[PDB]
Amino acid sequence: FVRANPRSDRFQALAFHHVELWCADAASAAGRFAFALGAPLAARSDLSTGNSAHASLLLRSASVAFLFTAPYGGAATTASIPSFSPGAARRFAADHGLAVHAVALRVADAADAFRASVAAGARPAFQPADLGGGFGLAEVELYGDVVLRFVSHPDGADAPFLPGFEGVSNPGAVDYGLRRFDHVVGNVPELAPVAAYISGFTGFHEFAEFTAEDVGTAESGLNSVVLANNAETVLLPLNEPVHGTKRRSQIQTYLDHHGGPGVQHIALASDDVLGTLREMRARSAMGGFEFLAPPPPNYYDGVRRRAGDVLSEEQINECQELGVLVDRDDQGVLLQIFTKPVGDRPTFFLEMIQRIGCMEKDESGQEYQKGGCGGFGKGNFSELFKSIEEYEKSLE
């Protein structure tokens, strides 16, 4: 945590493009995720689009783009994602269940970002192709069975997602306010070699970094590093467990139940996460996502000190009604809530956030939003535990 930014990207990583989850049936996860996140179906490539290889359904809420893909029974030239391996998809679901297979970035050229990546260490995974329309697809391995997909497309274009995908516009479809992906975090057994591997090939630089003296629940804990693209728009953190602890990490609990490295959580950022949260919790009771237990009152009594200078009492009283966590950085405020495990295993979960502050000006006096404004809520580990404990003593 020097916080420098050497702009060392080896390829132009413009933005997150989508995230592809694999499973045995895409209809069902897509279904739930739509209702739960307010990310209605925006595109499909199934049998009805002439694709006999895979069934791909795509949820969108603004920039947020959750792709769900699954194999049909048993062609192959009908695939719209030609990286797709039925054999490998089947394995993935058997090994993990609901989990993220790919993390896609939009880049300048897919061919180039690969070549530069592979040349700077990256393990290949899918050899660049032209999907027509001037769309490029290329994949390198990131951690474990998770791949880093590259996607390039002329700025105008047609196929809004990928060639072969037929758009979808249900009327009655409403989003809940999720604007963008913020960060995509991977649990790994040992951090150093993984961190090196990626920065090695992407040219991403360290943005932040927390070890675990009081950054890990109880005896166990985690060692987190954050890797950032030049613009600090794309953030790929990594957790590892702290070794030789007395109790077991949840980063280890993940690794065990998941059967390897993989994406632990994805943070979905909103411009009114409170408003978003209301919609999301209304669905909780009928098949949406359920959230972690609300912090006890003491927590908030504390956020009235920490962040009362920048949050109104009407805001904080709402943050409390909705179990939202609060954290400050050098110059900003992070609102933060975590879902319960989203699939069957205590593995993957989602993070809903809002970033308040850090808006700087350029060389002509134009305001931009500094990414990572508010940090990632490292304080809430420590601050939950002590309030959770102080609560219980308050009960004799």
Ligand X SMILES: Cc1nnc(NC(=O)c2ccc(C(F)(F)F)n3c(CS(=O)(=O)C(C)C)nnc23)o1
The yes or no reply on residue 173 touching a second copy (CB under 8 A) is: yes
Burial degree of 57 (CB within 10 A; 0-12, 13-18, 19+): buried
Q: Name the residue type at position 74.
A: G
CB of 88 to ligand X, least distance (A): 28
The yes or no reply on residue 250 touching a second copy (CB under 8 A) is: no
The yes or no reply on residue 215 touching a second copy (CB under 8 A) is: no
Instruction: Specify the residue, 12 or 63, whose C-beta has the smaller distance to Co ion.
Output: 12
Angle at 5 between CA 354 and CA 18, to 5 degrees: 50
| Of 35, 72, 381, 391, the one binding ligand X by CB under 6 A | 381
Which range touches ligand X (CB under 6 A), out of 121-129, 136-144, 240-248, 376-384? 376-384
The yes or no reply on residue 384 touching ligand X (CB under 6 A) is: yes
How many residues form the binding site for Co ion (CB under 5 A)? 10
DSSP string across 311-329:
S-HHHHHHHHHTT-EEEE-
The yes or no reply on residue 258 touching a second copy (CB under 8 A) is: yes
| Of 226, 269, 316, 324, the one binding ligand X by CB under 6 A | 226
DSSP string across 100-142:
EEEEEEEES-HHHHHHHHHHTT--EEEEEEE-STT-EEEEEEE
Is 275:225 a contact under the CB 8 Å cutoff? no
The yes or no reply on residue 204 touching ligand X (CB under 6 A) is: no
Q: Name the residue type at position 330.
A: D
**Residue among 316, 315, 335, 333 nearest 325 (CA):** 335
Instruction: Specify the residue, 152 or 187, whose C-beta has the smaller distance to ligand X.
Output: 187
Site map 80..119 versus a second copy, x via CB under 8 A = ----------x--xxxxxx---------------------
Output DSSP code: residue 339: B
| Bridge pairing between strands 13-22 and 64-71 | parallel
DSSP-assigned beta bridge partners for residue 239: 187, 224
The yes or no reply on residue 31 touching a second copy (CB under 8 A) is: yes
The H-or-E segment that residue 253 falls in is helix 250-258
Look at residue 250 and give the partner it binds from a second copy, Co ion, ligand X, none, a contact being a CB closer than 5 to 8 Å depending on partner kind.
Answer: ligand X
Site map 242..281 versus Co ion, x via CB under 5 A = -------------------------x--------------
**330-389: contacts with a second copy (CB under 8 A):** 341-346
Interacting residues toward a second copy by CB under 8 A = 23-36, 38, 40-41, 46-47, 55, 70, 72-73, 90, 93-98, 170-174, 256-259, 282-288, 341-346
